[PDB]
Structure formats: C-alpha cells, structure tokens
Amino acid sequence: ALWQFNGMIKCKIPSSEPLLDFNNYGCYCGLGGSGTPVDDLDRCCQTNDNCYKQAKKLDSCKVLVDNPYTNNYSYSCSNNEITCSSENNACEAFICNCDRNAAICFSKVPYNKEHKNLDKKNC
C-alpha cells in the first residue's frame, strides 16, 4: 500500500517526504505514466509502474479486494535497510518487492528539480 511505500522510501532517504518529493515527478512518478522517462529517477518509477502491472497479472492478486496502492503488506526498516516479511502472501510479497526495489532505486539516482511537476506534453 502507498503507506508502506512511503515508509520504505524514507527508510532509504531519511530526509524526504516521499509522497511529496516523489509524486508528480517526470513522466512516471505518480499516478499513471507514459512516454519516455526523462531521467534515471523517472525510469525507477517506470520500472515500479511495470512491476505493479505484472502484479495485476498474477492469479494471486486477482483474488484480492485491494489494489497495489491500498493492498497492505508487511516489511521492516532497520538501519535504513528494507526487509519484506515472509508473512506476506504471494500478491503482497510481489508488491513489497516492487516497492523495495523502487525505494532503493530512488536513493541511488540524481534528483532533478527541473522534472518536478513536469508538463505532461513532454510525455
């Protein structure tokens, strides 16, 4: 769920408010996404977007009355390291991994303010 994703990003980037810094950025960071990613951070979001898409394809996820944005899963942040729980069932575990990968990706690429609140005509 979005709440967990937010926590994961703060886990890797303690100085950030993910729902603000990583929302409405580039062509993919935020609800939806299309076009060519504008930078590596945007590409991180595209990958996470595609990961969610693959999740929806899983039989495990079709049974859930929740979407990746509201589907709660379990994880822990310790010493700024993210760990997905073995108590997560198939769908939740897949989503947890999608988010963990993105949070780590976000923390390893440049953040370009010029791409924040990007004019969708660039997508």
Binding site for Cl ion (CB under 5 A): 81-82
> Which secondary-structure segment (H or E) carries 77?
strand 75-78
Structure tokens at 117: 């609140």
| Contact criterion met (CB below 8 Å) for 106 and 47 | no
Instruction: Choose among Ca ion, Cl ion, none what residue 33 binds, the Cβ cut-off being 5 to 8 Å by kind.
Output: Ca ion
For the chain, the straight-line distance linking the first and the last C-alpha, in angstroms and rounded, comes to 26
CB 118 within 8 A of CB 27: yes
d(CA 73, CA 106): 20
Q: Is 24 in the site for Ca ion (CB under 5 A)?
A: no
Instruction: Please identify, among the stretches 3-11, 25-33, 80-88, 108-116, the one whose residues bind Ca ion according to the rule CB under 5 A.
Output: 25-33
CB of 103 to Cl ion, least distance (A): 7
Partner interacting with residue 28 (select from Ca ion, Cl ion, none; CB below 5-8 Å by kind): Ca ion
Q: Build a one-symbol-per-residue string for 36-75: x at contacts with Ca ion by CB under 5 A, - elsewhere.
A: -------------x--------------------------
